[PDB]
Design a protein around this motif. Structure first.
Motif, short mmCIF file in Angstrom:
data_model
loop_
_atom_site.label_atom_id
_atom_site.label_comp_id
_atom_site.label_asym_id
_atom_site.label_seq_id
_atom_site.Cartn_x
_atom_site.Cartn_y
_atom_site.Cartn_z
N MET A 140 -2.94 -0.88 4.76
CA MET A 140 -2.13 0.24 4.28
C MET A 140 -2.56 1.60 4.87
O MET A 140 -3.74 1.82 5.21
N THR A 141 -1.61 2.52 4.95
CA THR A 141 -1.85 3.83 5.53
C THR A 141 -0.79 4.85 5.08
O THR A 141 0.19 4.49 4.41
N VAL A 175 -6.89 3.97 7.90
CA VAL A 175 -6.31 2.69 7.46
C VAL A 175 -7.27 1.93 6.57
O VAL A 175 -8.48 1.89 6.82
N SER A 176 -6.71 1.35 5.53
CA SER A 176 -7.45 0.53 4.60
C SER A 176 -6.85 -0.86 4.65
O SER A 176 -5.63 -1.01 4.63
N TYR A 177 -7.72 -1.86 4.77
CA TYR A 177 -7.31 -3.25 4.75
C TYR A 177 -8.20 -4.05 3.84
O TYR A 177 -9.41 -3.85 3.79
N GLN A 178 -7.56 -4.97 3.12
CA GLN A 178 -8.23 -5.84 2.18
C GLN A 178 -9.08 -6.90 2.89
O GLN A 178 -8.60 -7.64 3.76
N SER A 219 2.54 0.07 4.42
CA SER A 219 1.65 -1.06 4.23
C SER A 219 2.26 -2.37 4.67
O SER A 219 3.47 -2.58 4.52
N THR A 220 1.42 -3.23 5.21
CA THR A 220 1.76 -4.62 5.48
C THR A 220 1.39 -5.46 4.27
O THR A 220 0.53 -5.08 3.46
N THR A 262 9.74 7.65 1.64
CA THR A 262 8.36 7.70 1.14
C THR A 262 7.59 6.38 1.07
O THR A 262 6.39 6.41 0.79
N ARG A 263 8.27 5.24 1.28
CA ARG A 263 7.59 3.94 1.47
C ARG A 263 8.15 3.24 2.70
O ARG A 263 9.34 3.33 2.99
N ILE A 264 7.28 2.54 3.41
CA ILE A 264 7.70 1.56 4.41
C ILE A 264 6.81 0.35 4.22
O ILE A 264 5.59 0.48 4.29
N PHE A 265 7.42 -0.81 3.95
CA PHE A 265 6.67 -2.06 3.73
C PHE A 265 6.95 -3.09 4.81
O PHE A 265 8.08 -3.19 5.29
N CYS A 266 5.91 -3.83 5.19
CA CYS A 266 5.99 -4.70 6.37
C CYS A 266 5.38 -6.07 6.17
O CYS A 266 4.53 -6.26 5.30
#
Ligand SMILES: [Co+2]
Ligand SMILES: [Co+2]
Ligand SMILES: [Co+2]
Ligand SMILES: [Co+2]
Ligand SMILES: [Co+2]
Ligand SMILES: [Co+2]
Ligand SMILES: [Co+2]
Ligand SMILES: [Co+2]
Ligand SMILES: [Co+2]
Ligand SMILES: [Co+2]
Ligand SMILES: [Co+2]
Ligand SMILES: [Co+2]
Lengths: 271, 271, 271, 271, 271, 271
Positions: free
Chosen positions: E201-202, F248-251, E210-211, E189-193
């Protein structure tokens, strides 16, 4: 012709700071990335500079690496802080037309509507500038052969006093030799300088003569205070663009600042 | 002769800020206190500017008070952001030699080695500059009856294109008519302008022509890009000093920055 | 008598930073150029300090070079962070009257209206301060021989608790020995300290006792939070001036900031 | 006892800024929110100040609201920038023990181990300080009837010259009369002042005498130079805490700065 | 479970700066002291990073020292900028469960309510990411054995295009292999990059992807400008907290800034 | 689809500043000029916010003017700091599809690949959120009649606890009722909120749920600490872009910072 003109980089050796606290090496590396990230890209970069601060070989190594990383043809000239021999050893590769003669480093550039002249005003064992007779006669030759085509000259030291209490005594000591050349040659219409770590400008007949601010530290203009000040006021450089018949120079801030935004008439004057 | 030359102050009403966020009033108040705190004090202050942003009375109220707090004689000329009638109503008491005719505000100053000429290039209902029939005639009268005494001109709009995508189409439209005066009068050797919010400089014959940075916000020079940019890069002004036969102009930073320190040779190159 | 009093320089070795990110070496080099660019020039510089951060010889090399570059006679004393032996090896040259005895580094200065006493409160293998019996008896001798002439003492560690949760436990552990000296000697009227990286001050009978802020990082005063905080809040030093009969100390900011401007009554309260 | 001691707030009217550019109102509002956010909360807040800049009602309106928003009991004394009548009208509700006679505003505080004495050194129509006949008498009554309980005094003007070229001729003119009280009452051991916008400190007998930095702008100490400088070097205040038998004062920075971090011995000296 | 998640440290070698002017080494040392001065203390620190900038051994030495100084268990994974072999030589000690196999560095963490999965997406000789088949089958095994218990994955490269003109071409080239795993496994349920130096994020079915921004420099998201920008906009990291049944991630600024203050209803809306 | 999503602007009256010192009006005016200067221009601007700070008319006057100066269609929803009636009176002209019933302000947008849903979670006389009986029903009507087209919701209050000591007790009280809608409609995949002044994000089923930083001041996430903090850490916003099947959402940072420069491989790793 678009020219990015910086000077007085004053590189220190790997992992040293100017005066122990001004990081000239980082500042310049920033300037370089700044310059080669410009949108309207210059045709070449000029450095009129005291390129290193002490004239030590370790300093030229840093300068060579950092200036090397610019993505432009370079035109480089020595200053009082430079060492003619080592300048030629390390930097001549990045500016081949300096020559093989450390004692007569100079060259003409006949690519643009205005011919560019690069000369060495620095003299060994002094802060003062000196134009040698072979520099002057080369200059006469260049100006004669050049005819009507306008010329601009780049040199470290300003050819005349600018009323600067600190900087005048160490100006180009025999600058009259150049002033007399400008009287002689109407085509000679710009002379640009370093040394003063300031944008100070003047006119002699057809010739616009100006010093440039430094890429890192600056020195204020005082008229009757001889105290050797320097400060970390904002650094900039000069861009030179051929604009039809006009040589125009504009200041390009090297500082990091807010903006830009777009002007909007409604936001400007609300009702 | 020492002149503090600032431009394009762009005052707003008491409450307000430029575009809602640039506090031009504070910034100018600072610039003012800055100036009248200088150690080498100028003989007068020149404001070549768009003194106010919208041409509104309450903007002139603010300007009158802040510019009024300078401890120097003032020379004030309007820009395209100014209102001729209101500029005269509020600012003429701070600069009596403008006259009392809002349409021909202009004057000569004869106190120094170089004659000073102040004119109004602004034109109602356009951002473009324009030299009125008899501004031109008055200009030529000053140079004709002036003999050898060198002349410098202060006008808001630059009298020729500078290659600035944004600023050129709104330069002084008939500026070539002033250029005709420099071709004809070797006596006229400086033209200094506002409008561009930038230090850009060129020479035409004997005349050094340069624009000034603004006291607050600046506009960058783009050649290709017409997007109406402005930014908050460092503000500065020009100091004009008479040094023997030379008029020299040097940039005086109005930013707040670290320094100054004294140059020490042993700190500069340690062993 | 004008004294520039700094402390807790905490020098790191060539090309290292305090904690890996605070450039103490640059900061101090700045302070030095700052100090020796002062207009009203002190008679000497005092460093009450933890002069190096780890007591490593490479660190003393940096300190020696940078402190060496000050253009003043120095008075230097060790701190908990210092190593007595190496302190004497590297710095004794810059402060000859420390002696040849690393274990009894101290001296009197009888140049000014107030005699200055420099003592070593640092103890090997601990953070706590310790005044040794030979320090105390030397101090008694000095105070007796001195008679009515006022005295001030410089020491790294504060002689009493100041209510500082972090700093008190590592204050001068036997500071009572000095407090008793102040009871004994009315002429003893200042005691100045480092260690606390703060301006905290107090009075014991005739004696004003104060710690100094550091030249780089600072430590806040917490009363019941023992967390070993430090911060980069503004650095300053103390200037000590003999003012007729008064010893006055004033804080001199070492931060870079805006101004100064001149106060103008009209600008202050407009109408 | 924990006291937050600030001074010289110099409030302006709702619209306005000090000298046109220093936003004293914002800065104080920040200082206020700063204070009532402290983790170790003071028992009261002292303002020894020129509470307002021009002595105007709308300045007192602003001050009343901002100082009113502090979540602490207040002790307010006027300075030469204040108006006695208006100070009482607007601020007496925030500090009832001032009395209801604007000419003898003064009061003692008996809640803590040290007696607090608040007085009004300001005098109508001069920047100079003055202790009224019966301020002096009231002072001596407090010390005479006070026995051993130590005393500290808060007054705006420093009671003796400090060697400050700018600030000395406008010190408390008859201050020697208070000095006479310290010679005679060993009980009186702190005198704290505003006026100087600086931390400068001295001792006279048992009395620690010190001035405070301002909450916003500061004035530098010059000995030789009378030029009326001010600058925006870092603002701070004094925290006064009772620690056993000691009154200790420590500087609390009001600047915004990096930190704090925790001291880690291994990060401090890596291997 | 509290996790402090940083990435793309990009360490340079001792006394070098990123690009010659960004001090990544100081910046990171700051971040570390920042992290281990947190009040609510994380259970471990994750670095998803391009840990060094060039993959040189001297760079790993710096990373090892600085990351070593964190006071937390670490979980470390390679990036395109890393060198698998040297990563394992220098950092494996600080993260023992990477293994002995440089080519298959990965591990599961079954301490918390959510299982953590650490994988190497970096591929030798390219910027692009690549998930190898043995990575995928290990991942399937982990997800099967894990059953209903939720899982999150840490990897350098984003598994899908995010519409970023610069960053997409060098995203994880075969990221479909992971996307298909998320379709297969509801517990994932999460993947972080890292890689993107941005918070972008998506969501893909049950998976929040999210990156992270970098600890030092950042790269903006452009959609149709391929220019390789980077900037020094504010750095932050992600904190991950198990909140009952929810995995929540919040941004924690690594910048130095003003505050905090406390919200006060009265100060918020005055009357 | 490109959306510029900002939140929690907290406008104040013309004269005033937030808490007396945070100039929210200027900051937002800057944010505005910032946005409508973007090179890749959004299709619309979302403000999920507490548009004004006190619910006062003169605050809405300011907001109307500043938000009115954006050169984009707007979607405006209220927060607990807003006044329903006044929000409609001043802002409905800038966002007609809110309706003309202040108690059921809400609307769907059907122009893009993802359906946009705007609702009002604010409730008179409490900081807590609340979804009115028929907000919930209207929500479910949109999802029921919407089929496959994905949905995203903008509401001020977060619909579930996030572990934030300060922000959780004032989340959307009956938020579980919206969570029930995500359990039942796989179509609903984004929920974006204001209120928290922070980027914190979680997933519940298919729904990415995230709060936004404020345009000016921020509030930090504490789990244990209930002290009502705010600070001035960097402001940013969220850009929402449709990229194929992905939202996609980006800061996007709204701070002013150094850069950008171009990445050069040779500058990155010199030899
Ligand atoms: Co030079
Ligand atoms: Co130079
Ligand atoms: Co104009
Ligand atoms: Co203008
Ligand atoms: Co110590
Ligand atoms: Co120390
Ligand atoms: Co006063
Ligand atoms: Co005052
Ligand atoms: Co990468
Ligand atoms: Co990276
Ligand atoms: Co809210
Ligand atoms: Co809010």
């Amino acid at each position: 012709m678009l020219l990015a003109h910086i000077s007085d980089t004053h590189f220190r050796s790997r992992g040293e700071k100017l005066y122990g606290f001004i990081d000239v090496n980082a500042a310049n590396a920033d300037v370089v990335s700044q310059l080669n990230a410009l949108r309207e890209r210059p045709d070449a970069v000029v450095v009129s500079g005291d390129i290193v601060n002490c004239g030590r070989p370790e300093e030229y190594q840093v300068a060579r690496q950092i200036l090397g990383s610019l993505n432009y043809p370079l035109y480089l000239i020595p200053g009082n802080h430079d060492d003619k021999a080592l300048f030629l050893e390390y930097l001549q590769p990045l500016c081949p037309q300096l020559g093989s003669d450390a004692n007569n480093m100079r060259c003409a550039v006949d690519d643009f509507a205005t011919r560019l002249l690069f000369i060495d005003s620095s003299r060994a064992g002094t802060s003062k500038g000196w134009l040698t007779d072979e520099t002057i006669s080369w200059l006469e030759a260049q100006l004669f052969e050049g005819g009507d085509k306008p010329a601009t000259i780049f040199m470290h030291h300003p050819p005349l006093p600018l009323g600067n209490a600190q900087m005048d005594p160490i100006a180009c000591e025999n600058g009259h030799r150049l002033l007399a050349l400008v009287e002689r040659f109407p085509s000679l219409t710009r002379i640009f300088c370093g040394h003063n770590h300031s944008l100070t400008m003047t006119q002699y007949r057809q010739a616009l003569i100006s010093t440039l601010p430094g890429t890192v530290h600056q020195v204020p203009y005082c008229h009757e205070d001889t105290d050797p000040y320097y400060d970390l006021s904002p650094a900039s450089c000069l861009m030179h663009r051929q604009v039809g018949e006009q040589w125009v120079s504009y200041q390009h801030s090297l500082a990091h600042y807010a903006g830009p935004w777009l002007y909007d008439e409604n936001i400007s004057c609300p009702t």
